[PDB]
Each structure stands twice: as structure tokens, then as C-alpha cells.
Design a protein around this nucleic acid. Structure first.
Ligand code: FES
Ligand SMILES: [Mg+2]
Ligand SMILES: [Mg+2]
Ligand SMILES: [Mg+2]
Ligand SMILES: [Mg+2]
Lengths: 45, 46, 105, 92, 161
RNA sequence: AAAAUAGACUACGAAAGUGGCUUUAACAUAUCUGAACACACAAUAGCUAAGACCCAAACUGGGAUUAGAUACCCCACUAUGCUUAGCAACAGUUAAAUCAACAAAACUGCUCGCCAGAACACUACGAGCCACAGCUUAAAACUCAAA
């Protein structure tokens, strides 16, 4: 049962990281992400 | 002194000319590196 | 540097011993060596039985070859000694006279 | 006062004595000398408490004995009978 | 480049009459028939003559830097062949760090000699980092995005004006 | 494959460690302190590809045994053992009254790290690293008068 909790936490962590990254370029004025940018999945093998 | 000693010694070296003569002279000779020591530290030549 | 080759050769007749010595010294010179002297220590019974090139030996002729060679030659020369069939055992060492005789007191 | 003692190193001290082999060259080809420091019955190398040699000369003799044994100059399991009549320099 | 093998040993270069000897004696007294250490000594004196003001002074910082540079080159040459020699890897790294420290001291004390050493030995002096912190994945990705966003915003600002 | 004597030696190396012989390279640094986060090593067992397999042997089977047999004896054979390719420091003093106790005679100077009752807690959460087991950093609430 510790597993499913652990990957759930990893998913929420990835979502938080993506939200912070999005906040950056939204505050910078860019409507979308930088051209050719794709957020990598850094918390999953 | 070392350079002069080497220059003198190089005369009597085994070149490719005197190879056969020196080989035969060696085969017609024997040298001994064996000596003994006494309690008094004296070298007893065979 | 200066090296000494201790060569234990097969117990052979004089022409064969001379031919083997000539071949060894020629190999030494071919590998860049200046041979200084050749000395015969005599033919004697080996301290133990030595097997070489699928033959068993109990006697041998002992020779010393003093020479100067580049450091890269020694390894090469060793390999040559491994192939010669008339050499029971060939060993290259740094010449004993080069080591300094520090005088204890 | 001239009768006072003076600072000085111990003048009665006996200097450390030199060993039999100090000042002499040890050669691996000199099987006669190297045979004076091995057991006649087993060929084992005698220690410094038997040979009486210094540490440096003991090490040189050991190295020469091993070198001569493997270069085909000296027997390993026994002392060569040709050298059994040599002067005895070992306290055994 | 190494000295030619025909060069005479450092101890046999100023002896009088060394040019009047047989070719065999010249070979016997050349780098060809010596160990690598004599070649390293020849390299060292060549560097001293080419760089330092007084080639006889060996206690100076620049002379020590030259000696350590020759030694570092020898270790690198050794390690090209013995890839699994860990002790010599340690010696090489320690020597490089020590030479960096000596170069820093030389820079702080004598700038002209520092420049001459850096040119002569081909050493490119580098400054130390200011902050020592772990650059984990999140930080690296965030920094890359921030650089990209700055680039895009600069393009937008330039075009819009 | 690992190296009787030497070695009653105490040497080399940062440590781990290094004891057959020869040869070639070769053993950093002219002050000290000062990295979890950098780079090298180290020992620790276990996995991923292959290969070898005499012998041994976790597990898995079979044989024999009291009256829950022998857990223990016998046979056979796996993973594995093997071979590559990889993942307090430093510098001084013995002068003082030596000094809770036991350890290991006491102290000074200077610097770094760490500690402020017990348990909760080599824990939870967060973060980093990895990823079958996880490792590092590391709390709070309740409780007690002790530990
Ligand atoms: S007395 Fe000189 S080495 Fe022993
Ligand atoms: Mg320090
Ligand atoms: Mg410290
Ligand atoms: Mg934990
Ligand atoms: Mg928390």
C-alpha cells in the first residue's frame, strides 16, 4: 500500500513542478510556453 | 674523468667486426665470481 | 641503461655454443644495444632440473653479457630469449656495478 | 675553577661493531658467499640473530639468495655440497 | 614535444671536450640510453631557460611551478598507458590542485611572471566558483526554462517596440 | 592457484592495504585550519549481459530414523563461490593545586563540526538521491519527573 501512495505523491509533485514552471512564463507575459519547450518528467524513471 | 674513462673503454667493446674473435676468446676463458668471508672479515680468494 | 644478461645455455659442442652466442649478441645489437664484454663462467650442473622447450636439462653453460641498451629494448630482448631453443634460461638485470656502494659506518 | 667537570660525550662508549660483510659488495653470482648464510640441511636462510649481519646486509643477502635461486645459480632445498667445507660464519 | 634522443645528459653537457668524443660515447651519454627521468630533467631546464629570469634559482615560485608542470606531464603520460592506476590518478589530481594554488599565489605576488608562466607552459588560469550547491534536476530544468522565457520575452520586446 | 626461511625485520602507502624474482613507469605540496553539497579512492554484499563448471553448497527433491523421529546422518542437483563487460585537526608546555569516578597523566593557544531532560524518533512530512529491500537531512502533538 506504501507504493500507490508513493507514486501518487510523485504525480502530485510533478504537477506542482509543472504549475511552477507555468507560473514563470505566465508572469513573464508569454501566453504559451517557450517555443519548443516540453516539461520533462523528472520524478519518474 | 668519467668521460675520458668511457672513451678509453669504448676501444675494447664488442663491435660487429670483432664478434667472432671475442666469442671464441670468451669460450676459451673462465671467470670466477665466487669468494668467501671469514669471521675476521677477510676475503678468501679461491 | 647498463644491463647484465645472465644466460644459461644448453650443454652443446663448441661450434653450437659459439653460434648461439653470436645469435644472441646479434639480437642484442639489433635491438639497439652496445655490448661491452662477454664472460664465460663455465659449464656446470644446474642447481636443479630445468625444463625448457620440451626438454629436460641438468647441465648448462653459464655466460654473462654486459651491455648498454635503451629501456624499451629490454622487454623486446626478453621475448627473443623466450623463443631461442638453445637458451635454458635468460635473465636481464640492471648491471651490479651501477648500484652505488654506500659506505655504512 | 679548572677542577670543575666539563660538558662532554661519554668517552668510554664502545662504538657499534662492524659486521663481517660491511664495505663488501654482495653479488647474486657469488654463490660461495651466499652459501655461507643458509642451512646445510634445508637451505633455509638464517636470520640476523644467527648470521649476525646488519639489517641492510641481511636484506641484501636475502635478496641475492632469492635472485640466485630463481636465476639458476643456487639450489633452493639444500646447500650445494661443494661449499660445505667453507669457513663457518653462523652461530648455530 | 620531447627532446631529441641524441641530446646529452644534463650532467654531461658542460663537461669540456664533449664534442671531441667518439659517436659511441655520444650515444652512451645521450637521452636514448637513459630512463625517462633524465628526459624530464632536460625538459625542466629547457622550460627554466625559456621562462624564468634566473634559471639557476630553483627555490622560486615560478621554478617550482615549472617543476610541478613537468611532473604533471609525466603523470599524464604514465596514465595514458595505465588507465587503472588509482594511486597515480590521485597524484596527478593533487599535483594539478597544488599547481593551481601556486599559480594563485604567483598571480597575487608577481603578475608579470604569472603571465610569462601562463604563456610559456600553456596554463589557462581559472577562477574558483563562488557558490558550492547541488544542481539537482528540478533546479536545472527551472533554470533552462527561465533562460528560454527570458529569450522569448526579449524577442517579444524587441519586435513590439 | 598463492608465495615456507629471510621476518627475533617494522618498512612503504591518504586510508583500505602491501611480504616470490626480473624489467619499465613511479611514490603531490615550503605555513596551519577550513565540503553533506566537487573530485578521486576505500570496504560492504547483491543485481544486469555473457562464458566456464573439477569441487563445494543456501534452496528443491529422494533415503534412513522417535513415537511431534536427527534442525543435525546419506544421495542428487540449483542460486552462489569463478572469469570478464558494466552499473576532531594543528602548534606549544610539564609549570602549577595532578585529579568527581572509571577509562587513556595533566593542561594551554587556535580553528572547524556538533550538543542543550526522557520518550515520541535510525520516526512522520518535505526535499535530494536512487529505485524489487531503500539511503541522507529530520519534526510536531499527547505523556512523564525523571531519564
Ligand atoms: S655495518 Fe655497514 S651495513 Fe652493516
Ligand atoms: Mg587544510
Ligand atoms: Mg576537521
Ligand atoms: Mg528514514
Ligand atoms: Mg516537514
Amino acid at each position: 500500500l506504501r507504493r500507490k501512495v508513493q507514486e501518487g505523491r510523485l504525480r502530485r509533485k510533478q504537477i506542482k513542478f509543472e504549475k511552477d514552471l507555468r507560473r514563470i512564463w505566465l508572469k513573464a507575459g508569454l501566453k504559451e510556453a517557450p517555443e519548443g519547450w516540453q516539461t520533462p518528467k523528472i520524478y519518474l524513471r | 674523468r668519467e668521460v675520458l674513462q668511457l672513451q678509453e673503454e669504448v676501444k675494447n667493446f664488442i663491435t660487429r667486426e670483432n664478434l667472432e674473435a671475442r666469442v671464441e676468446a670468451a669460450l676459451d676463458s673462465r671467470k670466477n665470481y665466487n669468494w668467501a668471508i671469514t669471521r675476521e672479515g677477510l676475503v678468501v680468494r679461491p | 641503461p647498463r644491463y647484465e644478461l645472465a644466460l644459461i645455455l644448453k650443454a652443446m659442442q663448441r661450434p653450437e655454443t659459439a653460434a648461439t652466442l653470436k645469435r644472441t649478441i646479434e639480437a642484442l645489437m639489433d635491438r639497439g644495444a652496445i655490448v661491452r664484454d662477454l664472460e664465460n663462467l663455465g659449464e656446470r650442473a644446474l642447481p636443479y632440473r630445468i625444463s625448457a622447450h620440451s626438454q629436460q636439462h641438468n647441465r648448462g653453460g653459464y655466460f654473462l653479457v654486459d651491455f648498454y641498451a635503451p629501456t624499451a629494448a629490454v622487454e623486446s630482448m626478453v621475448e627473443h630469449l623466450s623463443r631461442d631453443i638453445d637458451v635454458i634460461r635468460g635473465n636481464i638485470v640492471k648491471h651490479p656495478l651501477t648500484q652505488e656502494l654506500k659506505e655504512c659506518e | 675553577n679548572e677542577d670543575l667537570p666539563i660538558s662532554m660525550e661519554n668517552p668510554y662508549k664502545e662504538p657499534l661493531k662492524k659486521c663481517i660483510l660491511c664495505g663488501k659488495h654482495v653479488d647474486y653470482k657469488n654463490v660461495q658467499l651466499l652459501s655461507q648464510f643458509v642451512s646445510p640441511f634445508t637451505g633455509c636462510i638464517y636470520g640476523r640473530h644467527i648470521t649476525g649481519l646488519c639489517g641492510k646486509k641481511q636484506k641484501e643477502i636475502t635478496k641475492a639468495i632469492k635472485r640466485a635461486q630463481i636465476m639458476g645459480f643456487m639450489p633452493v632445498t639444500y646447500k650445494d655440497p661443494a661449499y660445505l667445507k667453507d669457513p663457518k660464519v653462523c652461530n648455530i | 614535444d620531447d627532446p631529441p634522443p641524441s641530446t646529452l645528459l644534463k650532467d654531461y653537457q658542460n663537461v669540456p671536450g664533449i664534442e671531441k668524443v667518439d659517436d659511441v660515447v655520444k650515444r652512451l651519454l645521450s637521452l636514448e640510453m637513459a630512463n625517462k627521468k633524465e628526459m624530464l630533467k632536460i625538459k625542466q631546464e629547457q622550460f627554466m631557460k625559456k621562462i624564468v629570469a634566473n634559471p639557476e634559482d630553483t627555490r622560486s615560485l615560478e621554478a617550482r611551478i615549472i617543476a610541478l608542470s613537468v611532473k604533471i606531464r609525466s603523470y599524464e603520460e604514465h596514465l595514458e598507458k595505465h588507465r587503472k592506476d588509482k594511486a597515480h590518478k590521485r597524484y596527478l589530481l593533487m599535483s594539478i590542485d597544488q599547481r593551481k594554488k601556486m599559480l594563485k599565489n604567483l598571480r597575487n605576488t608577481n603578475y608579470d611572471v604569472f603571465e610569462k608562466i601562463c604563456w610559456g607552459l600553456g596554463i589557462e588560469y581559472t577562477f574558483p566558483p563562488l557558490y558550492y550547491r547541488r544542481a539537482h534536476r528540478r533546479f536545472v530544468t527551472k533554470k533552462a526554462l527561465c533562460i528560454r522565457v527570458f529569450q522569448e520575452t526579449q524577442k517579444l520586446k524587441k519586435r513590439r517596440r
